[PDB]
Amino acid sequence: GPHSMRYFETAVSRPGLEEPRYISVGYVDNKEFVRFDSDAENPRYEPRAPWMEQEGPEYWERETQKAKGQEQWFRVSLRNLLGYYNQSAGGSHTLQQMSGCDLGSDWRLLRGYLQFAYEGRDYIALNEDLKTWTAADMAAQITRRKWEQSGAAEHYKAYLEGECVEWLHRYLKNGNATLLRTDSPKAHVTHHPRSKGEVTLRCWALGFYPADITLTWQLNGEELTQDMELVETRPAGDGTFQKWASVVVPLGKEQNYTCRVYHEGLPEPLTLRWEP
Amino acid sequence: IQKTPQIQVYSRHPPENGKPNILNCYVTQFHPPHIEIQMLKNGKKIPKVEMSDMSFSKDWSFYILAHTEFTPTETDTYACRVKHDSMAEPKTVYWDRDM
Amino acid sequence: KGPANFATM
């Protein structure tokens, strides 16, 4: 099964304040495992999933120092961004970073990731070759030229291919008691009265992990994009997710309708219909 | 540039009157990250509301899950009230037990 | 363990 690791970092300034706040969050296979936040009393990286209390005094200490180093890097960059965009002081601003590595089921590097955004928008990103940069904005060509001239790419390429891949392998052995596991959806259909002679069939999928899931309704073979009603997949808040798709139906005709649930955890898709 | 929060209000487990549950207010796709989420029972601020940390998705927009313990009765209404800079006024969305 | 950044913006 493939694997991954990410650090999502952010720095935010507001018009009141003297300094921005910097926050970092680490993820293994998309589950949060570490976090740092400059608003805290004692800013430190903290373990975020039972399996990270393993790392000793040295880990947390050394990662914390890196975090205070990122924070200054982010402070100086906001300041520079403000001038690149000719933004007068008096606004809120955001700079965000995503970094890390995807592994194949063989545990080999599949793809490195380095991307940045400023005010919510793509600012500069490391291309998949880990050699060249994409930066769209006129204002960003400055940064892209400083980074090319300074060999930045070859540095991040080293971290993406070496230290990143390595520490993920390590974190992968350390918690091999959860980190592969998928929870399959349990699905059911509920019956709701609606407009005269018409009811709502609402297919629920519940209890599943990871979040990616597809729900579909058919009228004897024909998929209903016609105005189906779904909700965005949502956290149950116990680590599992929920989704539902509903359709309006002729009253009585409610067995020409089947709900299918597609999910990676499943032996095969579920097939479902209202059952009174 | 501002992205307007999207809001779902929903219980953790299928709701049943008399049985304790958790009510969630999941607030997504917003920017900038500064935001205020209150949950409301019968039109009044609920006091012990849990609030997940700052996170952001791969499209770079932020999201937050606020939640609180509750026991549904057939008479009470619940709602999530969300104040954010992309909206002139606070946005309230009511809990629907069938959703 | 997370990147440590190089040249600033």
Residue A148 phi, psi dihedral angles, 5° rounding: -65, -50
**Residue count of chain B:** 99
Q: Which of residues 148-177 of A touch C (CB under 8 A)?
A: 150, 152, 155-156, 159-160, 163-164, 167
Using CB atoms, which residue from A14, A25, A236 is nearest to B12? A236
Residue A199 phi, psi dihedral angles, 5° rounding: -120, 175
- The residue range of the domain holding B37 is 1-99
Instruction: Say if CB A189 and CB A271 are below 8 A apart.
Output: no
Q: Which of B5, B22, B1, B8 is nearest to B80 (CA)?
A: B8
For residue A154, what are its two tokens? Answer: 């070859």
Topology of domain A182-272 in CATH is Immunoglobulin-like (2.60.40)
Residues in chain C with CB shorter than 8 Å from the CB of A156 are 3, 6
Contacts of A165 (CB under 8 A, 6+ apart): A101, A103, A109
Say if the Cβ atoms of C3 and A99 lie within 8 Å: yes
Just give the CATH number of A1-181.
3.30.500.10
Domain of B99: which CATH number?
Answer: 2.60.40.10
Q: Which residues pair with A251 in a beta bridge?
A: none
Contacts of B48 (CB under 8 A, 6+ apart): B68, B69
Query: CA-based angle A19:A94:A101, to the nearest 5?
Result: 115
For residue A51, the Cα-to-chain-centroid distance in whole angstroms is 20
Residues in chain A with CB shorter than 8 Å from the CB of B4 are none
Query: CA-based angle B29:B33:B39, to the nearest 5?
Result: 75
Instruction: Say if CB A26 and CB A98 are below 8 A apart.
Output: no
The reply to whether A87 touches chain B by the CB within 8 Å rule is no
Residue with tokens 């991307």: A115
Instruction: Say if CB A6 and CB A99 are below 8 A apart.
Output: yes
Question: Could you state, in order of their start, the residue ranges of all structural domains in chain A?
Answer: 1-181, 182-272
Partners of chain C (3+ Cβ pairs below 8 A) = A
| Touch of B by C (3+ CB pairs closer than 8 Å) | no
Residues in chain B with CB shorter than 8 Å from the CB of A121 are 1, 60
> Counting beta carbons within 10 angstroms of the beta carbon of residue A261, is it exposed (0 to 12), middle (13 to 18) or buried (19 or more)?
buried
| Touch of C by A (3+ CB pairs closer than 8 Å) | yes
Domain count, chain B: 1
For residue A79, what are its two tokens? Answer: 């300041």
Residues in chain A with CB shorter than 8 Å from the CB of B26 are 234-235
> Counting beta carbons within 10 angstroms of the beta carbon of residue B28, is it exposed (0 to 12), middle (13 to 18) or buried (19 or more)?
middle
Among chain C, residues having any CB pair with chain A shorter than 8 Å are 1-9
The reply to whether A33 touches chain B by the CB within 8 Å rule is no
Say if the Cβ atoms of C3 and A159 lie within 8 Å: yes
Using CB atoms, which residue from B12, B28, B55 is nearest to A238? B12
The reply to whether A223 touches chain C by the CB within 8 Å rule is no
Q: Which of A57, A66, B51, A38 is nearest to A47 (CA)?
A: A57
Q: Please, which experimental method was used?
A: X-ray
Distance from C-alpha of B30 to C-alpha of A158, rounded to nearest angstrom: 34
**How many C-beta atoms lie closer than 10 Å to residue A70's C-beta?**
22
Query: Smallest CA–CA separation between B61 and chain A, in Å?
Result: 7
SS3 A133: strand
Radius of gyration for chain B, computed over Cα atoms and rounded to the nearest angstrom: 14
Closest-CA residue of C relative to A140 is: C9
Say if the Cβ atoms of A25 and B58 lie within 8 Å: no
Q: Which of A96, A109, A25, A28 is nearest to A67 (CA)?
A: A25
